[PDB]
Design a protein around this motif. Structure first.
Motif, PDB file in Angstrom:
ATOM      1  N   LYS A  48      66.233  56.603  63.898  1.00 55.62           N
ATOM      2  CA  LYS A  48      67.448  57.372  64.100  1.00 55.62           C
ATOM      3  C   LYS A  48      68.620  56.503  63.690  1.00 55.62           C
ATOM      4  O   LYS A  48      68.532  55.272  63.777  1.00 55.62           O
ATOM      5  CB  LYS A  48      67.594  57.827  65.563  1.00 55.62           C
ATOM      6  N   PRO A  49      69.726  57.101  63.239  1.00 56.46           N
ATOM      7  CA  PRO A  49      70.875  56.279  62.813  1.00 56.46           C
ATOM      8  C   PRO A  49      71.424  55.391  63.916  1.00 56.46           C
ATOM      9  O   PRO A  49      72.109  54.394  63.621  1.00 56.46           O
ATOM     10  CB  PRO A  49      71.913  57.320  62.369  1.00 56.46           C
ATOM     11  N   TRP A  50      71.191  55.762  65.174  1.00 64.92           N
ATOM     12  CA  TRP A  50      71.692  55.068  66.354  1.00 64.92           C
ATOM     13  C   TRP A  50      70.654  54.168  67.013  1.00 64.92           C
ATOM     14  O   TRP A  50      70.917  53.647  68.104  1.00 64.92           O
ATOM     15  CB  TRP A  50      72.227  56.091  67.367  1.00 64.92           C
ATOM     16  N   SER A  51      69.513  53.932  66.347  1.00 58.43           N
ATOM     17  CA  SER A  51      68.392  53.180  66.913  1.00 58.43           C
ATOM     18  C   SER A  51      68.705  51.714  67.206  1.00 58.43           C
ATOM     19  O   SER A  51      67.957  51.084  67.954  1.00 58.43           O
ATOM     20  CB  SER A  51      67.175  53.210  65.970  1.00 58.43           C
ATOM     21  N   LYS A  52      69.759  51.145  66.634  1.00 56.54           N
ATOM     22  CA  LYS A  52      70.100  49.769  66.971  1.00 56.54           C
ATOM     23  C   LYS A  52      70.953  49.674  68.240  1.00 56.54           C
ATOM     24  O   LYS A  52      71.283  48.560  68.668  1.00 56.54           O
ATOM     25  CB  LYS A  52      70.797  49.125  65.767  1.00 56.54           C
ATOM     26  N   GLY A  53      71.293  50.821  68.850  1.00 57.95           N
ATOM     27  CA  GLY A  53      72.139  50.876  70.037  1.00 57.95           C
ATOM     28  C   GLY A  53      73.471  50.204  69.772  1.00 57.95           C
ATOM     29  O   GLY A  53      74.122  50.462  68.760  1.00 57.95           O
ATOM     30  N   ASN A  54      73.901  49.329  70.683  1.00 58.27           N
ATOM     31  CA  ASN A  54      75.141  48.592  70.491  1.00 58.27           C
ATOM     32  C   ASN A  54      74.884  47.171  70.011  1.00 58.27           C
ATOM     33  O   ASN A  54      75.794  46.336  70.056  1.00 58.27           O
ATOM     34  CB  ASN A  54      76.001  48.607  71.756  1.00 58.27           C
ATOM     35  N   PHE A  55      73.667  46.879  69.545  1.00 55.44           N
ATOM     36  CA  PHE A  55      73.350  45.520  69.093  1.00 55.44           C
ATOM     37  C   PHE A  55      73.896  45.260  67.696  1.00 55.44           C
ATOM     38  O   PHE A  55      73.920  46.161  66.861  1.00 55.44           O
ATOM     39  CB  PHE A  55      71.839  45.295  69.094  1.00 55.44           C
ATOM     40  N   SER A  56      74.358  44.021  67.449  1.00 56.17           N
ATOM     41  CA  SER A  56      74.807  43.656  66.107  1.00 56.17           C
ATOM     42  C   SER A  56      73.597  43.514  65.189  1.00 56.17           C
ATOM     43  O   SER A  56      72.478  43.303  65.634  1.00 56.17           O
ATOM     44  CB  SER A  56      75.566  42.339  66.126  1.00 56.17           C
ATOM     45  N   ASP A  57      73.830  43.602  63.878  1.00 60.84           N
ATOM     46  CA  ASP A  57      72.705  43.404  62.975  1.00 60.84           C
ATOM     47  C   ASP A  57      72.081  42.028  63.155  1.00 60.84           C
ATOM     48  O   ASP A  57      70.870  41.878  62.994  1.00 60.84           O
ATOM     49  CB  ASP A  57      73.091  43.642  61.513  1.00 60.84           C
ATOM     50  N   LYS A  58      72.882  41.017  63.515  1.00 58.64           N
ATOM     51  CA  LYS A  58      72.324  39.677  63.692  1.00 58.64           C
ATOM     52  C   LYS A  58      71.330  39.645  64.840  1.00 58.64           C
ATOM     53  O   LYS A  58      70.242  39.084  64.713  1.00 58.64           O
ATOM     54  CB  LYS A  58      73.423  38.666  63.970  1.00 58.64           C
ATOM     55  N   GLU A  59      71.704  40.208  65.989  1.00 60.80           N
ATOM     56  CA  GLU A  59      70.784  40.212  67.112  1.00 60.80           C
ATOM     57  C   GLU A  59      69.550  41.040  66.804  1.00 60.80           C
ATOM     58  O   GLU A  59      68.436  40.665  67.181  1.00 60.80           O
ATOM     59  CB  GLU A  59      71.462  40.707  68.387  1.00 60.80           C
ATOM     60  N   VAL A  60      69.716  42.176  66.128  1.00 56.66           N
ATOM     61  CA  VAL A  60      68.536  42.967  65.791  1.00 56.66           C
ATOM     62  C   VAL A  60      67.598  42.146  64.924  1.00 56.66           C
ATOM     63  O   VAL A  60      66.394  42.082  65.172  1.00 56.66           O
ATOM     64  CB  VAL A  60      68.919  44.286  65.103  1.00 56.66           C
ATOM     65  N   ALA A  61      68.149  41.470  63.902  1.00 57.67           N
ATOM     66  CA  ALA A  61      67.305  40.643  63.052  1.00 57.67           C
ATOM     67  C   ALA A  61      66.630  39.526  63.851  1.00 57.67           C
ATOM     68  O   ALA A  61      65.467  39.187  63.590  1.00 57.67           O
ATOM     69  CB  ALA A  61      68.136  40.073  61.902  1.00 57.67           C
ATOM     70  N   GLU A  62      67.330  38.954  64.839  1.00 55.45           N
ATOM     71  CA  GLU A  62      66.718  37.897  65.640  1.00 55.45           C
ATOM     72  C   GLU A  62      65.536  38.446  66.432  1.00 55.45           C
ATOM     73  O   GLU A  62      64.469  37.822  66.492  1.00 55.45           O
ATOM     74  CB  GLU A  62      67.749  37.305  66.607  1.00 55.45           C
TER      75      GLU A  62
END
Ligand SMILES: *[C@@H]1O[C@H](CO[C@@H]2O[C@@H](C)[C@@H](O)[C@@H](O)[C@@H]2O)[C@@H](O[C@@H]2O[C@H](CO)[C@@H](O[C@@H]3O[C@H](CO[C@H]4O[C@H](CO)[C@@H](O)[C@H](O)[C@@H]4O)[C@@H](O)[C@H](O[C@H]4O[C@H](CO)[C@@H](O)[C@H](O)[C@@H]4O)[C@@H]3O)[C@H](O)[C@H]2NC(C)=O)[C@H](O[C@@H]2O[C@@H](C)[C@@H](O)[C@@H](O)[C@@H]2O)[C@H]1NC(C)=O
Ligand SMILES: CCCCCCCCCCCCC/C=C/[C@@H](O)[C@H](CO[C@@H]1O[C@H](CO)[C@@H](O[C@@H]2O[C@H](CO)[C@H](O)[C@H](O)[C@H]2O)[C@H](O)[C@H]1O)NC(=O)CCCCCCCCCCCCCCCCC
Ligand SMILES: CCCCCCCCCCCCCCCCCCCCCCCCOC(=O)CCCCCCCCCCCCCCCCC
Ligand SMILES: *[C@@H]1O[C@H](CO[C@@H]2O[C@@H](C)[C@@H](O)[C@@H](O)[C@@H]2O)[C@@H](O[C@@H]2O[C@H](CO)[C@@H](O)[C@H](O)[C@H]2NC(C)=O)[C@H](O)[C@H]1NC(C)=O
Ligand SMILES: [Cl-]
Ligand SMILES: [Cl-]
Ligand code: NA
Lengths: 280, 100
Positions: A48-62
């Motif tokens: 979903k377009p909102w699947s990263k929630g409020n996380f930054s791309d950096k934290e998601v990648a981590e």
């Protein structure tokens, strides 16, 4: 608020032999899938377009890196230890971890693990707890895992610190889809039942979201206690299907109706009326 | 860590069946263990190629479940089914769609 209240990730690791293991993984809000794990790349698929929630791309990648390293290391470590743990191939390990928002606002986290389709361990207040079904094998595992530097600390942070803020951010980010109201459609059908002069009536309810629903066979204002609910089954695109059945004498089917109550109906319940002699 | 579970197979349409009206055919395969499984949707005994399915998941008791679906236009004569193979099955189990 309505809709899902929990986030969890799942793991299925299938060990074919001492040199071949494959893992499948995914991320969920209750039973709604929001993340896939792509074994081709070792990265997550955001459904979903909102699947990263409020996380930054950096934290998601981590986090994707943490999971990638974990999936690889886990298969390797289990293959190394399989002999030490009297392990017969093939075998399958499952895991689930996440957190859930309760009434009153508390967020509770969990982690469980399985072997051979039976509970094996859990994480209770940052500690590895062997399940009785896992027997001595799970006891040996708990003692082993805690020896690995950093592992239990990373689990503790992810479960009790990262997951709650993730959950809140994503439930908010996804609200237009998570809290939407989709009206069911309903219809009746009939069939024979084993007893003499016995019929089974079926009230079908399909296409509703969110999941909570109320379906009852009725006679005027009297709810028929004999109503039997089927399992709630999924449709594609985040709706469900449910059947409510009633077993009735032939001459007593006249007067029955099915009443459906759902959050989307704005207090306007669906009412279908059973009519006899093949008049639908 | 050993007892295998045979799949439960439920075939149902998204909407009430109306001959000639486009619909969706669902096959929900659940309660099985281990996860390796083969699922096909059939039209008049022939495999449908344009079929979608969910990523692997499992229930609270660790049993796996999958949803397979395809668009379909029911007719009075055509037969649809879900064909499943699993380690617990000697041969593929075929469950026909019943609009009832
Ligand atoms: C993703 O969202 C998370 C949820 O955010 C909130 O909810 C969403 C739906 C939106 O409405 C957002 O606008 C909203 O912020 C964020 O996590 C939350 O961050 C806030 C701060 O922004 C944080 O609040 C602080 O809480 C502590 C108290 O926390 C302890 O105690 C409570 C119970 O009382 C307990 O529940 C907690 O677990 C802790 O034990 C408090 O001391 C802080 O006060 C200080 O700061 C405020 C200014 O905000 C100031 O007025 C005060 O005077 C004081 O100096 C403050 O109230 C939330 O508790 C936290 N909630 C959760 C569940 O974690 C998240 O923010 C990031 O993580 C946080 C943990 C924190 O490090 C933030 O700075 C980070 O940005 C956000 N983003 C990400 C990437 O996760
Ligand atoms: C039974 C109790 C728990 C049950 C499951 C736990 C494991 C199960 C069996 C494990 C056996 C062996 C498996 C292999 C494990 C490991 O391979 C690896 C890492 O390995 C070494 O660990 C070091 C830890 O320090 C790490 O160091 C880091 O290095 C970096 C660069 O240097 C940075 O600098 C970092 O800061 C620094 O921390 C190092 O990379 C690495 O190599 N896994 C782990 O970390 C823990 C596993 C975590 C995954 C499972 C927990 C799931 C919890 C989730 C709740 C939901 C998530 C939150 C929501 C977000 C979703 C968008
Ligand atoms: C954005 C990123 C979002 C996308 C995320 C989707 C992908 C997730 C990737 C997988 C991580 C999922 C972890 C779920 C919780 C894991 C639970 O941990 C366990 O499985 C515990 C193990 C349970 C049974 C272990 C059996 C032990 C028997 C094996 C013998 C050898 C093992 C000894 C090991 C040392
Ligand atoms: C461990 O298993 C791998 C994986 O493939 C398995 O074997 C296939 C023939 C089939 O039964 C699959 O379901 C299994 O997952 C073995 O790799 C195979 O090796 C054979 C010959 O050794 C080769 O012809 C195949 O192409 C290989 N396939 C793959 C996917 O690698 C592997 O050899 C097994 N290892 C041991 C030590 O027994
Ligand atoms: Cl991977
Ligand atoms: Cl829901
Ligand atoms: Na990789």
């Amino acid at each position: 608020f309505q809709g899902p209240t929990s986030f969890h990730v799942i793991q299925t690791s299938s060990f074919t032999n001492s040199t071949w293991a494959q893992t499948q993984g995914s991320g969920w809000l209750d039973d709604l899938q929001i993340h896939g794990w792509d074994s081709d790349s070792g990265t997550a698929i955001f459904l979903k377009p909102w699947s990263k929630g409020n996380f930054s791309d950096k934290e998601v990648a981590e986090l994707e890196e943490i999971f990638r390293v974990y999936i690889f290391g886990f298969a390797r470590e289990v293959q190394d230890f399989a002999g030490d743990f009297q392990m017969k191939y093939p075998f399958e390990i499952q895991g689930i971890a996440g957190c859930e928002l309760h009434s009153g606002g508390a967020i509770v986290s969990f982690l469980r693990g399985a072997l051979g389709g039976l509970d094996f361990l859990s994480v209770k207040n940052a500690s590895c707890v062997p399940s009785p079904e896992g027997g001595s094998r799970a006891q040996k595992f708990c003692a082993l895992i805690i020896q690995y530097q950093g592992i239990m600390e990373t689990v503790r942070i992810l479960l009790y610190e990262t997951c709650p803020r993730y959950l809140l951010g994503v439930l908010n980010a996804g609200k237009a889809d998570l809290q939407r109201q989709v009206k069911p459609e309903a219809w009746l059908s009939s069939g024979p039942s084993p007893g003499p002069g016995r019929l089974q009536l079926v009230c079908h309810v399909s296409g509703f979201y969110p999941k909570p629903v109320w379906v009852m066979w009725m006679r005027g204002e009297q709810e028929q206690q004999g109503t039997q609910l089927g399992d709630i089954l999924p449709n594609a695109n985040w709706t469900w299907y449910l059947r409510a059945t009633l077993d009735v004498a032939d001459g007593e089917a006249a007067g029955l109706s099915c009443r459906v109550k759902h959050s989307s109906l704005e207090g306007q319940d669906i009412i279908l009326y059973w009519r006899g002699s093949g008049l639908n | 860590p050993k007892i295998q579970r045979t799949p439960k197979i439920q075939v149902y349409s998204r909407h009430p069946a109306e001959n000639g009206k486009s619909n969706f055919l669902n096959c929900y395969v659940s309660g099985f263990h281990p996860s390796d499984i083969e699922v096909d949707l059939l039209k008049n005994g022939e495999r449908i190629e344009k079929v979608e399915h969910s990523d692997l998941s499992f229930s609270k008791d660790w049993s796996f479940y999958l949803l397979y679906y395809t668009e379909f236009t029911p007719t009075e004569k055509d037969e649809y089914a879900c064909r499943v193979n699993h380690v617990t099955l000697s041969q593929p189990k075929i469950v026909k769609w019943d609009r009832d």
